[PDB]
């Protein structure tokens, strides 16, 4: 009995609290619902950042390049984080946000593969330009969060043109948290070599009785922000909203 005047100004109040700008968008069936305080920016392009995890892990496994229990070795060499300092698998990198993982296996899958393959899916605006190992962070590849949802309901449904297989794997890698009998898979993503920064959590709840209903989280990040801020967010959202 909750209007949904209440449900989007509380909402709205997350993002106005943590002092940003952003949207959430939520998919039900086929309907899609925007929330948040920047409504706007629903239907823009930014970078994916490393939401591109998710498809980039698709291509690989689909392509043979590599497999889920495959031991990327770190090669010795100082990471940005000392987590990263480590050898680990795909689901294991997935987790960390280990970049240089992730950019390894974009320089096997190579720069022609992967462009057709980002074409076939049709994610974004599609364009991967000429450097193979970084089009996700820093252009030229943009999606919207409208994209993004869809991306997400995509996956969660298994529609996406890959094996069935492919799709299970790589959605086992994603799952972040289990809240009274849901579950949230997701991934975030934050454009730190961008102005403005960007920041996602892209993915969907499982509820218990198997329905499932995506989300996509656009938020603007500042320097200082914490990553945190967008699972907190999101799961204030799910949680207003009674989808956990
Ligand atoms: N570089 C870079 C950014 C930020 C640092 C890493 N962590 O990713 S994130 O916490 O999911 O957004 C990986 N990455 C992806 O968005
Ligand atoms: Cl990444």
Do not use: C
């Amino acid at each position: 009995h909750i209007s949904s005047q209440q449900h989007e100004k509380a909402i709205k109040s997350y993002f106005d609290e943590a002092q940003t700008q952003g949207v959430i968008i939520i998919k039900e069936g086929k309907n899609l619902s925007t929330y948040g305080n920047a409504l706007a920016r629903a239907n823009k392009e930014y970078v994916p950042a490393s939401t591109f995890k998710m498809l980039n892990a698709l291509i690989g496994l689909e392509n043979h390049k590599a497999t889920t229990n495959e031991i990327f070795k770190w090669d010795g060499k100082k990471r940005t984080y000392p987590m990263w300092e480590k050898d680990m698998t795909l689901g294991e990198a997935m987790a960390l946000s280990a970049v240089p993982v992730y950019q390894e296996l974009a320089r096997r899958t190579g720069l022609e593969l992967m462009q057709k393959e980002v074409k076939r899916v049709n994610f974004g605006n599609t364009n991967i330009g000429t450097q193979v190992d970084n089009f996700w962070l820093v252009g030229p590849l943009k999606i919207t969060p409208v994209q993004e949802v869809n991306f997400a309901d995509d996956l969660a449904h298994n529609r996406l043109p890959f094996k069935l297989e492919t799709q299970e794997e790589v959605k086992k890698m994603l799952l972040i948290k289990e809240v009274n009998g849901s579950k949230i898979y997701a991934k975030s993503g934050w454009g730190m070599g961008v102005t403005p920064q960007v920041g996602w959590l892209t993915g969907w709840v499982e509820q218990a009785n198997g329905k499932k209903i995506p989300f996509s989280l656009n938020l603007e990040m500042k320097e200082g922000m914490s990553g945190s801020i967008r699972n907190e967010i999101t799961y204030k959202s799910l949680e207003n909203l009674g989808i956990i």
